[PDB]
Amino acid sequence: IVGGQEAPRSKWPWQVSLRVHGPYWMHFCGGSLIHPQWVLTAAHCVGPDVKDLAALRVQLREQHLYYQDQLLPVSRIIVHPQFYTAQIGADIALLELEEPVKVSSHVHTVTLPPASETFPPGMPCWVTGWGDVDNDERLPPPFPLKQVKVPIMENHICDAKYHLGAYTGDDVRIVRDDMLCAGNTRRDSCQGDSGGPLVCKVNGTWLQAGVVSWGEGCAQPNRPGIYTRVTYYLDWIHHYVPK
Ligand SMILES: NCc1cccc(C2CCN(C(=O)c3cccc(-c4cccc([B@@-]5(O)Oc6ccc(C(=O)N7CCC(c8cccc(CN)c8)CC7)cc6O5)c4)c3)CC2)c1
């Protein structure tokens, strides 16, 4: 997370950290709890190639990475079958946990948007995670969960911005219809936040609008952050995750 601030303990109780086995169980991507056995994340965090499940674990909401880890194993990685790269799209995946988690005020699910919600500009939305605090700047220890309020840009503004300073033909779409843009040069996600949630408050409920997907660097001029658009993938999600 670039810009913004350390998150409060009572906020983002759905935030998840994904961990890869090595010298230590290292954070590489975010996720969100959308059901007691289901984490929603980005496909590029776990694919496109098939990983060893035993090398992957999940950590539920933690104010600081590593200090009070209670890792949780994973029984299934479902990755969207359209997925090959983030730039093409369908950068969305699901993790099933070996057990259902227990829900509380500290730790509970996020609500998915109804298919009609467009998330127009001037909606207040926050993105969260333990990723880099700028281009090539690691989040320093003690690795607090960060948040930043990001302005949503309409898809067509954002596509056009990605064409400024580019050779790519204006008619050749870069920001796709299954994607969502937010951020500016002060406020953005970065590496390490991929797979975590962009959430927007609507009628006093938090809805996850996006999954942190990609961008040309972080908080770079004319390069807003790009997120997978959750509305686009509800039917796919619901094929696996009960209502
Ligand atoms: N601010 C929002 C935000 C949120 C989260 C994360 C980000 C980051 C996204 C990635 N970043 C980019 O700037 C970026 C931007 C655009 C495109 C890319 C990108 C472009 C093309 C490919 C990829 B890649 O992710 O997709 C890949 C597919 C394959 C490979 C690979 O295996 N190699 C590359 C090709 C190499 C190669 C070269 C020559 C010949 C061969 C054949 N033997 C093979 C071999 C290694 C490597 C790959 O990298 C990424 C990266 C940094 C910031 C941003």
| Dist CA 187 CA 77 (whole Å) | 31
101 HSE (CA, 13 A, CB side) = 30
Contact 201, 173 (CB under 8 A): no
Residue whose CA lies nearest to ligand 1 atom number 24? 85
Cα–Cα separations (whole angstroms), residue 95 to 1, 55, 98, 195, 242: 23, 13, 10, 11, 14
* CA gap 215, 219 in Å, rounded: 9
The amino acid occupying position 5 is Q
**Closest of 152, 148, 194 to residue 31, by C-alpha:** 194
Whether ligand 1 lies within 6 angstroms of the CB of 47 is answered as: no
Tokens of residue 193, six digits: 């936040």
189 lines ligand 1 (CB under 6 A): yes
**210 within 8 A of 182, measured Cβ to Cβ:** yes
From 27, 135, 180, 214, give the residue whose CB has the most ligand 1 atoms within 8 Å, as the site to mutate: 214
Please name the fold of domain 13-109+232-243. Thrombin, subunit H (2.40.10)
Return the closest-CA partner of residue 220 out of 146, 166, 156: 166
Which of the listed residues 216, 220, 226, 227 should we mutate to test ligand 1's pocket, taking the one with most ligand atoms within 8 A of CB?
A: 216
Residue nearest to atom 18 of ligand 1 (CA): 216
Q: What's the reported resolution, in angstroms, to a tenth? A: 2.5
Residue 169's CB: how many other CB atoms inside 10 A?
A: 8
H/E element holding 213? strand 205-214
State which amino acid sits at residue 187: R
DSSP 149: E
> Rounded CA gap, 96 and 80, in Å?
14
What is the domain partition of the chain in residue ranges?
1-12+110-231, 13-109+232-243
Q: Could you list the active site residues?
A: 44, 91, 194
